From a paper:
Here we describe the characterization of Designed Ankyrin Repeat Proteins (DARPins) that were selected as tight binders against all folded domains of p63. For the initial development of DARPins as tools to study the p53 protein family we have focused on p63.
The tetramerization domain of p63 differs from the oligomerization domain of p53 by the presence of a second α-helix per monomer that reaches across the tetramerization interface and thus stabilizes the tetramer. DARPins were generated against the complete tetramerization domain including the second α-helix. After initial selection screens, the identified DARPin 8F1 was further characterized by ITC measurements showing a KD value of 54 nM. The crystal structure of DARPin 8F1 in complex with the tetramerization domain revealed a 2:1 DARPin:TD ratio, consistent with the stoichiometry observed in ITC, with each DARPin binding to the hinge region connecting helix 1 and helix 2 of two monomers. Because these two hinge regions are part of the tetramerization interface this structure predicted that only tetrameric but not dimeric conformations of p63 should interact with this DARPin. As expected, the DARPin did not bind to the stable dimeric isoforms TAp63α, TA*p63α, and GTAp63α but did bind to the tetrameric isoforms TAp63γ and ΔNp63α. Intriguingly, our findings thus demonstrated that DARPin 8F1 represents a conformation-specific binder for tetrameric p63 isoforms. DARPin G4 and the SAM domain-specific DARPin A5 showed a strong pulldown signal for p63 while the tetramer-specific DARPin 8F1 showed no pulldown signal at all, consistent with the fact that oocytes only contain dimeric TAp63α.
Residue numbers in the entry:
A (entry chain D): 360 to 402
B (entry chain E): 1 to 126
C (entry chain C): 359 to 402
D (entry chain A): 359 to 406
E (entry chain B): 360 to 407
F (entry chain F): 2 to 126
Write the structure that this text describes.
């Protein structure tokens, strides 16, 4: 579902861009992949 | 337990032809996957190890295995510009219409990365 | 003018980014001297 | 309310999380009229 | 490398945890995944 | 100061006699908290007419701005304190003051359905 966030300020924009990228890339992963990643980190 | 699968993934990435053959005579899972769904065939196609691609296909490697982002071996061979690997994957039934989770075919990744020779081969493979 | 538009895939990601955007945008109105005073208690 | 501890690996990720945390904390202390006026100005733009 | 961020509130904590782990996770993603994502972002922003 | 912080609290809380005492005691009439809220801001916000009056008599800046460009007249308009609006106007409150979101006191009066205050501000525009 494609939505548009209006942003005032370059610094705020760049910060939200970095976070958006990281969250969107994580969202593609199935739960079991995220779960396995978490376990492997905890070891 | 067994690190045979892990050792085959590493051997296929590193291009250690002989090590791959040894690991599979020793019963290593040809379709072993890491946490992102990368198989030996994925890694060999990515890193351009033609003879390893060949032995894996001969031993029952799934030519259309998907990573967690819907990437296939043919996608990786196209992205990273390995023409002979693209041709071998095509002859062994690689899905030319496979789309990753970003809607990209192998052809699309070839175009996006200026590998126009590979793009042409993929377009004709139709 | 001066408003940049960030495309977002998914309501959950959107709502998260909206909350953060609001906090950062409201903070941007403050002078450095105001924000720096708050941060002192943090460094303690 | 509850004070909780987030483990972070890496200065850059830490600094980013610190800025966001402190923007959210500092926002709780802003008067309603500031927050409400901000939100209505957001809607009075999204209309355009 | 290890730094602890104190957080007030479960909801702020869970939000910062999700962001931390998305950012940490990204370090381990292959170039082709990141690069394809970024080009699809630009190939949209130009369309809209 | 201590006295400053106690004047901000007394003005907010509507402690008339505490405000007079704090000020005979040399409390800064234009003491400001970390957002730039003055005693006059808080008395206007919370509708303490007699406190607004003593503060203005003792040299409170009628057009003091908080960090978001809010004036006492903005707060009296937003929070529906008509008598305080008229006192602030008579002491030189800037009817056309804009906060950092572009809002005048008139705009905050309309935003909060305070039509009486909006009319007085319009006729003072």
């Amino acid at each position: 579902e494609l939505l548009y966030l209006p942003v005032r300020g370059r610094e705020t924009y760049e910060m939200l861009l970095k976070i958006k990228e990281s969250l969107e890339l994580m969202q593609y992963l199935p739960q079991h992949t995220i779960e396995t990643y978490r376990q492997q980190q905890q070891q | 337990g067994s690190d045979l699968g892990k050792k085959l993934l590493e051997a296929a990435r590193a291009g250690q032809d002989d090590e791959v053959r040894i690991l599979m005579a020793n019963g290593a899972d040809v379709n072993a996957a890491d946490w992102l769904g990368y198989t030996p065939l994925h890694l060999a196609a990515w890193y351009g190890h033609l003879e390893i691609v060949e032995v894996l296909l001969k031993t029952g490697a799934d030519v259309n295995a998907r990573d967690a982002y819907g990437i296939t071996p043919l996608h990786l061979a196209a992205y990273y510009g390995h023409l002979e690997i693209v041709e071998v994957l095509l002859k062994h039934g690689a899905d030319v219409n496979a789309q990753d989770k970003f809607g990209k075919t192998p052809f699309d990744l070839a175009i996006d990365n200026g590998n126009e020779d590979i793009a042409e081969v993929l377009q004709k493979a139709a």
